[PDB]
Amino acid sequence: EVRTIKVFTTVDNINLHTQVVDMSMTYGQQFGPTYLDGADVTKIKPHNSHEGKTFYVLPNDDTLRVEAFEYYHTTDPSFLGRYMSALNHTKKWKYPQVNGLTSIKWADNNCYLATALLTLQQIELKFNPPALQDAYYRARAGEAANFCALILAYCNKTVGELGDVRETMSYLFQHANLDSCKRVLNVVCKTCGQQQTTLKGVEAVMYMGTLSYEQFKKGVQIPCTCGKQATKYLVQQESPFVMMSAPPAQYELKHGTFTCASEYTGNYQCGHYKHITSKETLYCIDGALLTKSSEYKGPITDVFYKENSYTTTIK
Numbered sequence: 001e002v003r004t005i006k007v008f009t010t011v012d013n014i015n016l017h018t019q020v021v022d023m024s025m026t027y028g029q030q031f032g033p034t035y036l037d038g039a040d041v042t043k044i045k046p047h048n049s050h051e052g053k054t055f056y057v058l059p060n061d062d063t064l065r066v067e068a069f070e071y072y073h074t075t076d077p078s079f080l081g082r083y084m085s086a087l088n089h090t091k092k093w094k095y096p097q098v099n100g101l102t103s104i105k106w107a108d109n110n111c112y113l114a115t116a117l118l119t120l121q122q123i124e125l126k127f128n129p130p131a132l133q134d135a136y137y138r139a140r141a142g143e144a145a146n147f148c149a150l151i152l153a154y155c156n157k158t159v160g161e162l163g164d165v166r167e168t169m170s171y172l173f174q175h176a177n178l179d180s181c182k183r184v185l186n187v188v189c190k191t192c193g194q195q196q197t198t199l200k201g202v203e204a205v206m207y208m209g210t211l212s213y214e215q216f217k218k219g220v221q222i223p224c225t226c227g228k229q230a231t232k233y234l235v236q237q238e239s240p241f242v243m244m245s246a247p248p249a250q251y252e253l254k255h256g257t258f259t260c261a262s263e264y265t266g267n268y269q270c271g272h273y274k275h276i277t278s279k280e281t282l283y284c285i286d287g288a289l290l291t292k293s294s295e296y297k298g299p300i301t302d303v304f305y306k307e308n309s310y311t312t313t314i315k
């Protein structure tokens with residue numbers, strides 16, 4: 001006897017596609033690679049309990065290609081399988097609310113993802129891909145499994161791999177609307193004179209080399225092409241935040257002078273991030289763990305500051 005069930009296939013979990021499947025054949029033989037809420041069911045034959053359920057598939061016809069691109073804003077052929085593989089793990093993580101924010105209980109080297117997620121909830125940022133819009137909304141509400149899996153897929157990191165917070169933020173910023181953001185810098189060399197530069201989008205909100213927004217406004221020393229040392233300072237800034245980053249170093253964080261920051265303890269090959277947020281006092285969120293202090297010193301690698309419009313007085 002021939003036995004079938006009805007299931008739906010999807011690439012975006014919104015647009016469904018009716019299918020009839022043969023219970024004597026695997027999903028793989030019928031759809032190609034197939035997933036059920038992250039689980040790889042490619043080598044599995046249909047079960048009775050599968051009737052009416054939704055399965056993710058790869059974009060193997062033009063309708064799915066268009067639906068996948070519109071939702072994710074990527075055409076990397078291994079994206080969906082990387083997203084499903086991550087999701088099968090992130091759906092098992094825990095997402096406690098810590099001081100009003102969605103955090104992540106430590107697992108699988110995910111400390112960099114927790115600090116990133118905590119940071120996002122403290123800065124003004126809108127994502128462009130619908131997939132990230134929808135999953136970030138759920139994450140803010142507490143159900144961050146899809147959002148975390150998407151970050152991993154977009155950053156090309158697997159669960160368990162050690163991640164860098166600045167790189168992760170660069171990827172997310174690439175998929176956000178920062179088109180309004182503008183930065184003007186000036187560089188002064190005693191032998192070469194001056195040169196001004198204007199930066200836009202992601203490059204207007206990120207800086208690598210110093211943690212201090214004030215020192216960026218006063219000036220910082222960088223090499224020049226003659227061998228001289230030149231000074232770079234911030235001429236104009238238009239953005240709702242800025243991110244200052246540097247190799248980890250002992251640094252003092254003062255209440256009320258920054259929004260939030262990342263601390264990294266360890267070495268190049270492995271280590272651990274924690275998150276510091278400046279509220280009524282200084283809170284350190286380490287996954288599910290929370291402590292407080294009136295002052296803070298530690299190896300800081302990123303600091304986030306509020307902004308709207310700044311213009312220098314330097315002449």
Ligand SMILES: NC(=S)N/N=C/c1ccc(O)cc1O
Binds near residue numbers: 065067069072074078
């Ligand atoms: N190539 C064309 S026209 N669209 N494909 C979209 C697409 C493909 C693979 C994938 O994993 C995610 C996607 O958004």
Ligand SMILES: [Cl-]
Binds near residue numbers: 090092093
């Ligand atoms: Cl896991």
Ligand SMILES: [Cl-]
Binds near residue numbers: 094096105288
């Ligand atoms: Cl927990």
Ligand SMILES: [Cl-]
Binds near residue numbers: 125126132
């Ligand atoms: Cl959004």
Ligand SMILES: [Cl-]
Binds near residue numbers: 255256
């Ligand atoms: Cl204070």
Ligand SMILES: [Cl-]
Binds near residue numbers: 259305306
């Ligand atoms: Cl600030």
Ligand SMILES: [Zn+2]
Binds near residue numbers: 191193224225228230
């Ligand atoms: Zn020079």
